[PDB]
Design a binder for this molecule. Structure first.
Ligand SMILES: *[C@@H]1O[C@H](CO[C@@H]2O[C@H](CO)[C@@H](O)[C@H](O)[C@H]2NC(C)=O)[C@@H](O)[C@H](O)[C@H]1NC(C)=O
Ligand SMILES: *[C@@H]1O[C@H](CO[C@@H]2O[C@H](CO)[C@@H](O)[C@H](O)[C@H]2NC(C)=O)[C@@H](O)[C@H](O)[C@H]1NC(C)=O
Ligand SMILES: *[C@@H]1O[C@H](CO[C@@H]2O[C@H](CO)[C@@H](O)[C@H](O)[C@H]2NC(C)=O)[C@@H](O)[C@H](O)[C@H]1NC(C)=O
Ligand SMILES: CC(=O)N[C@@H]1[C@@H](O)[C@H](O)[C@@H](CO)O[C@H]1O
Ligand SMILES: CC(=O)N[C@@H]1[C@@H](O)[C@H](O)[C@@H](CO)O[C@H]1O
Ligand SMILES: CC(=O)N[C@@H]1[C@@H](O)[C@H](O)[C@@H](CO)O[C@H]1O
Ligand SMILES: *[C@@H]1O[C@H](CO)[C@@H](O)[C@H](O)[C@H]1NC(C)=O
Ligand SMILES: *[C@@H]1O[C@H](CO)[C@@H](O)[C@H](O)[C@H]1NC(C)=O
Ligand SMILES: *[C@@H]1O[C@H](CO)[C@@H](O)[C@H](O)[C@H]1NC(C)=O
Ligand SMILES: *[C@@H]1O[C@H](CO)[C@@H](O)[C@H](O)[C@H]1NC(C)=O
Ligand SMILES: *[C@@H]1O[C@H](CO)[C@@H](O)[C@H](O)[C@H]1NC(C)=O
Ligand SMILES: *[C@@H]1O[C@H](CO)[C@@H](O)[C@H](O)[C@H]1NC(C)=O
Ligand SMILES: *[C@@H]1O[C@H](CO)[C@@H](O)[C@H](O)[C@H]1NC(C)=O
Ligand SMILES: *[C@@H]1O[C@H](CO)[C@@H](O)[C@H](O)[C@H]1NC(C)=O
Ligand SMILES: *[C@@H]1O[C@H](CO)[C@@H](O)[C@H](O)[C@H]1NC(C)=O
Ligand SMILES: *[C@@H]1O[C@H](CO)[C@@H](O)[C@H](O)[C@H]1NC(C)=O
Ligand SMILES: *[C@@H]1O[C@H](CO)[C@@H](O)[C@H](O)[C@H]1NC(C)=O
Ligand SMILES: *[C@@H]1O[C@H](CO)[C@@H](O)[C@H](O)[C@H]1NC(C)=O
Lengths: 426, 121, 426, 121, 426, 121
């Protein structure tokens, strides 16, 4: 005869959807001074002779991290200077030019500063992407649906990596298979407490400063037959990108409200150039050839063509990214049709980023001569609709940007109570 | 924790100390404070639920335990040596997962019968 | 000899005043999406051979629920559009009339919308209960003491039932005696985890959609000798009430603040009628006869008369209630002196409900043709001061409305540690 | 929980399992989150206070317990059969309510004496 | 042979930096109705034959209490009436005078009260310490950097004592040596749960209503060689101080902001005197002689001189303190060079107290005839830079005021798990 | 708590009941509520950490405990009578503090060996 027996701590792990807590290494927007320090001590535990199913683009951790970075940005942005007084009619005109570049305007308005007293004229520059004409006469673009608060310069929104840990009784299993395509089973799975790397870099159509793939190039997509679901592609090797804004601009510290300081462009000292990105055309051509070869591996020897975006907004049709303080939008039609390739990039100031109804932000200018050197490591492709497949860069949903890093993490709760038979009496 | 999970049932039966140990710690103001506060309340609630389940059975404070109830064959007719040397704990649970609730009810009432038998004093 | 012995879990329950948590069944103001789902599983446990003292109109649960519904309303009302810009002088006039109905005015003002720019005239209708004249010239009634925020139409404040549960170690004892009059001892008491029904319906002088009594009619009152303490009467059978606002009104979506939309009455299409409640006069006469018989049972064969309210405010002297989006106030002087009885009801918009200093609310109009069918199940009576007793409908304190449902619930903490003697040595 | 409370003391002494069982569960963001968080912190604090009181006596982890101290007559001179077959728990506590604290102090110090007697090793 | 053995609860206490919770005895700013009641039951436990190191002016408790009283003041001050509308140009003039006292002005402005309507003239008085001229024309002093909210009169900011307790596993050791000078070892140390007395009295250069020293006078200072570090001196015996504002002033309840009420000085009925503090000159001379004797005990027979402040702001150079509703600033140059000594004191209204960027407060006037009787029990001295030492009253850092009471408290966590050898086998 | 701390090791070994007792209580809305809530979460976490450390050793639920492991001389060569009658617990810890981590690891692995020896059934 046999008797049931209770063991405390057998290795059984249940499903997901619990809460994770931050952990930062040795100010900024996602408060580093508000997470517990990470004991770095890189420690894992390989689970030999196991197998389990990952379902990447349905994961919990992606949703938790996105919904949490929204709650960090929109909470650090709570106490900053608002903008409602700065929405008067703006009497603007063109700026002095020397070479063919319109784009910037020398606007002038009347600002309430000491209440029921003399109001300054207080000229200021504004891009012709932050201005709508109410037909000479103009206004801030986002003063029709939402009023937003300038991100205070004392804090900096450049990304430093975050480490998402799990509380007791919860472990994050990590799949270390090289050729893993997001979903399905995989072998050689380790267990972890705190996730690696994952820098919250916001971008579009070009994952920047992201984690490289290994061995070959992988393709991730909900259903390759479906058209509306996004497509993510990692890169065998990073493609260097070097993007510069070559101007020297002055920062007018102007008053607006008692203890309300607003920072506007003052003047451009020197030549008026265009903001632009640089890519190695030979390297990009090799990368494009390799990735299209990988995708033709996924299709029955079908010829594949690339085309730019169709009709979206400036946040979608362009490689929207965040440099050292400024917000760039680059028309990437050149890449997708020893010699470098140049991308013309327009810089925007009042942006509606994450596409919220009720949110925008004013980005105070940086004092000129800003450069960003980064690595393209990801491609966000979608196809629409004869015997040909056409791929276009495509964004919209920001979650995919987090999905490209957390593709190898799931959260599981431990079930320590196990029951099994043996010869034991009482 | 989650150690010999790949090893056999018997092999896992020998290395269960780490899961028992690492349950009240790790592997060793609404910004983030509420997040970690809710996490560390959830941790202690999980630990206390395990303690309660062990208490209402005859295994309060024991890593190894035996009971008086022998189970019926319908749940599993597999041989002992095959059971403890061929598969892992997870597939065993998946085989039993349809019956886990019934055994816990059987466990708790068995304890009540045992205590009342010992309560004759 | 005997020895003391410790038992873990003897049935002893201590007193009250702990915290309860919500539970909602399968949006609105009292967030349903913020309480744990109720495992419905109606489960109780009758306690044979027990007796205990209930003291209904001193209970804790009533105070907790009222203080909590205030914290829900005044927290869901936090992010809605405020009203300070809409308090300018209003140049109004009368509306077109055809039959004898003053009551509505076609006001006109100057609204700040784009700041330091042209301000619209933007005519809007307003009831002559939301207007005070500062003697042609008028203003919003609640722009002298408090500024309040319009309840955003996307959320709906119609009541759905809430279930108040108790945490571990706390049980809510429920008295199931039919003839229970709120206070005193009662037999056949069960224990519960989560309370039944209890819909947070705000009303006055007429409990609507409330829980019926059983068998006979009951009377509840602090001290029948005292005059200032309220009186509650349940109903043997519900009296149907059918109250209609028979107009078709237009909703002007008007701008006021960047991202600040205010909704005002646009126009009335059709005939101008009066809002009016309907009651079955035969049914009400029978109900009144039965209730006055029950009250004469409580008095030494004393003749009892009913009279309307004396001198209170419009929130007290009238059957103030909340229909599908609108706030009705009905002069109930007809009931208390095959043929129906009609009540003339005036509708108000900016209300100070719960009578707070610092709170009101703007109720955006509903798009016409609104009806509310409900059951009168309670009477709130008070008497004032020869050889006669006169009863009048009377409100003021909103807590009594919750007291009519939670009259059979008390919270008790468990004392599991018991000590008793037996022959046991160690 | 609160089962045989209407039954006699002896009858209640046999059905004390349910109250012990249903103590970490039920009968089975300031909207409401803080409310249930505070409630479930209070629940575990109550459970842990009961556990502490049971531990500092010789009844840590036992539903049934016995002590070495026989109580004084002054608290009650009622006969055993009348106590255990005619009376419930509640107004019995009410009778002892004036003396409850003293026995707790007597319990804990009697416990210490038993340890130091057993601590001679 | 011996074996290690584990004891639960040996007396070992680790270091500090945990969290403490308030406790108030049987409204005001630091909410008394928000701390748990103190079970008074004065209970300590003397630890015979122990010794430990205290390091007073590095303690945790001082920082926690200061950072917490800031979070109480700046949270009770959250819902009060703001001041932005009241910053218009002020057309003022002098007040009527009879004797040589400028100091008060009869300002007049235009207040927005019903929005886009007639604005009152609404004269009000203001001290010539709350006014800056923007050269006839004046403005509120703190309408250039920060807007602040008047402290609502319904709450009173007079201090009542707070009791700082420790949670379980944490005990506050208290050193009872009489001659203890803050840092170093001391004998006869007791253990406590909840701290004694400690009233949060904000002052400068004169600790008021503070705890007396015992036996002799003590000197506390980071490094007597250093000059920038503050110096605290307790008093053998309290020196009585009696400070009066002898005027009868009217409180104009004025509107500004719908539902907002601002309280300004109305008029002075009677004679126009000066606010002035009183001290016993004989008592102060004796106290000064004793303290300078004590300090010469600390120096090699060096002659010591006292001089007033050098060049600080009005919050530093003067004995700034809080009377029954008003804020006094007294030029103490008389004390430091049967007959009383009189201090001329100027009263301020909009103060920047604790010296924050972004904070001030409007103190509504009290209705005349205010007196404050208190005991000087502490001196805040600093020295600067031949063969002489010169001491001056000096503040700036408010923390020192809390340091004068919590000089005999440290927090320690208990380590109940001890290990030791004995003859015990298993 | 912190009673005979000034007395000798042997004297302190007899009055350790108070420290064990007064660990879940005292010596008997962001104004202050969050402060006391965080305090009373920290209290229970500390108590549970002590309970865990006692449980994973052979001392779960005992104020006095003995173990099978004898320690090496290197940590201390002081005589027993001097140790238990001349100094206090704190200076003893300070002498041992450099070795506390090692013994805990030695404690837990010694515990595992004793279970597996007793687990032969
Ligand atoms: C983009 O790629 C680099 C590649 O790593 C660098 O490789 C060079 C040689 O290939 C080596 O000399 C450097 O030490 C490597 N590390 C550097 C430069 O940090 C990645 O390291 C970065 O992700 C990118 N480099 C940037 C952003 O400068
Ligand atoms: C008011 O009373 C009804 C009464 O219950 C209804 O009774 C009729 C016959 O008497 C029966 O046909 C219905 O099924 C019953 N239930 C209904 C109509 O829901 C209560 O049910 C409600 O509280 C009220 N009815 C309303 C508001 O329509
Ligand atoms: C300042 O000192 C008093 C001193 O204490 C008082 O002493 C007198 C006689 O010396 C005695 O009659 C009183 O009862 C004592 N107590 C009082 C007056 O409360 C302190 O008690 C106070 O700290 C101060 N007195 C004040 C502020 O009135
Ligand atoms: C003897 C006994 O109680 N057996 C139970 C019963 O529910 C059923 O026979 C079967 C599963 O439904 O096995 C189990
Ligand atoms: C012997 C003993 O401890 N007696 C106690 C004492 O408190 C008192 O004599 C009486 C009640 O106050 O009985 C009990
Ligand atoms: C036998 C044994 O385990 N010895 C250990 C080892 O760490 C070392 O020899 C020394 C201290 O470092 O003593 C102890
Ligand atoms: C705007 O700028 C133009 C430049 O010609 C100037 O003439 C005009 O007065 C300015 N203001 C307005 C109101 O047009
Ligand atoms: C702003 O102020 C100036 C003062 O010169 C005034 O002329 C102008 O009309 C105002 N608004 C405009 C039109 O810019
Ligand atoms: C990846 O890069 C390596 C580097 O040499 C190359 O050999 C390999 O062919 C590449 N594979 C793909 C799929 O790009
Ligand atoms: C980008 O490339 C162009 C190539 O003509 C070069 O002139 C320019 O300086 C580059 N920008 C950089 C390196 O920022
Ligand atoms: C108000 O309406 C009346 C209607 O006769 C009109 O005459 C008047 O101009 C309007 N405005 C004012 C300011 O009266
Ligand atoms: C509102 O604006 C109109 C513009 O026609 C003006 O005539 C009127 O006086 C302003 N205020 C009033 C009185 O309604
Ligand atoms: C309650 O209603 C029933 C229904 O028939 C009736 O028989 C009874 O008399 C009523 N009692 C009272 C007190 O209304
Ligand atoms: C109310 O009763 C009257 C009776 O004359 C009827 O005309 C009217 O339609 C009723 N209202 C309703 C049913 O909404
Ligand atoms: C200010 O007060 C003076 C007092 O002479 C008066 O003449 C003047 O009109 C007032 N207002 C202004 C704007 O000066
Ligand atoms: C304030 O209003 C008055 C109304 O008489 C006006 O004369 C004055 O100029 C306005 N502002 C000043 C200067 O005080
Ligand atoms: C303290 O006061 C006492 C009171 O008489 C006095 O004897 C002693 O000398 C004083 N000591 C100092 C240092 O002031
Ligand atoms: C302060 O002392 C002076 C001495 O001349 C006296 O006249 C005055 O009344 C005193 N003030 C008080 C007691 O408030």
């Amino acid at each position: 005869n046999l008797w049931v027996t209770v063991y405390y701590g057998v290795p059984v792990w249940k499903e997901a959807k619990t809460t994770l807590f931050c952990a930062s290494d040795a100010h900024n927007v996602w408060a580093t001074h508000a997470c517990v320090p990470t004991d770095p001590n890189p420690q894992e535990m390989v689970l030999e002779n196991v197998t389990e199913n990952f379902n990447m683009w349905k994961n919990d951790m992606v949703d938790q991290m996105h919904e949490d970075i929204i709650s960090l940005w929109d909470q650090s942005l709570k106490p900053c200077v608002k903008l409602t007084p700065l929405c008067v009619t703006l009497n603007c005109t063109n700026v002095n030019v020397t070479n063919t570049n319109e784009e910037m305007k020398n606007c002038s308005f009347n600002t309430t500063t000491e209440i029921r007293d003399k109001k300054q004229k207080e000229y200021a520059l504004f891009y012709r992407l932050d201005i709508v004409p109410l037909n000479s006469e103009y206004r801030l673009i986002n003063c029709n649906t939402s009023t937003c608060t300038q991100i205070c310069p004392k804090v900096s929104f450049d990304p430093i990596p975050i480490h998402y840990c799990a509380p007791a009784g919860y472990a994050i299993l990590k799949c270390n298979n090289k050729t893993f395509n997001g979903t399905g089973p995989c072998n050689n799975v380790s267990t972890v407490q705190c996730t690696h790397g994952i820098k919250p870099v916001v971008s579009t159509q070009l994952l920047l400063n992201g984690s490289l793939a290994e061995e070959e190039i992988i393709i991730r997509s909900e259903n390759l037959t479906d058209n509306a679901k996004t497509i993510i592609v990692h890169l065998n090797e990073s493609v260097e990108i070097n993007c510069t804004r070559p101007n020297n601009m002055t920062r007018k510290s102007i008053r607006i409200g008692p203890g309300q300081t607003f920072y506007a462009l003052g003047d451009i000292i020197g030549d008026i150039r265009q903001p632009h990105c640089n890519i190695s055309e030979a390297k990009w051509n090799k990368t494009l050839q390799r990735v299209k070869k990988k995708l033709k591996e996924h299709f029955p020897n079908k010829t594949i063509k690339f085309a730019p975006s169709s009709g979206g907004d400036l946040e979608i049709t362009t490689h929207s990214f965040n440099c050292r303080g400024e917000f760039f939008y680059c028309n990437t039609s050149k890449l997708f049709n020893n010699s470098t390739i140049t991308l013309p990039c327009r810089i925007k100031q009042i942006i509606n980023m994450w596409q919220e109804v009720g949110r925008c932000m004013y980005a105070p200018p940086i004092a000129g001569n800003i450069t960003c050197k980064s690595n393209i490591t990801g491609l966000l492709l979608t196809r629409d609709g004869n015997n040909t497949e056409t791929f276009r860069p495509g964004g919209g949903d920001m979650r995919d940007n987090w999905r490209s890093e957390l593709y190898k993490y799931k959260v599981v709760e431990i079930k320590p109570l196990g029951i099994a038979p043996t010869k034991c009496n009482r | 924790f989650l150690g010999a999970a790949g090893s056999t049932m018997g092999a896992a039966s020998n290395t269960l100390t780490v899961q028992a140990r690492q349950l009240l710690s790790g592997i060793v103001l609404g910004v983030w404070g509420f997040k970690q506060l809710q996490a560390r309340v959830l941790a202690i609630e999980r630990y206390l639920e395990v303690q309660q389940l062990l208490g209402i059975w005859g295994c309060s404070g024991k890593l190894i335990c035996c009971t008086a109830v022998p189970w019926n064959s319908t749940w599993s007719n597999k041989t002992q040596e095959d059971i403890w040397d061929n598969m892992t704990w997870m597939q065993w649970d998946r085989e039993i997962s349809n019956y886990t609730d019934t055994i816990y009810r059987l466990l708790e009432e068995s304890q009540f019968q045992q205590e009342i038998n010992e309560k004759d004093n």
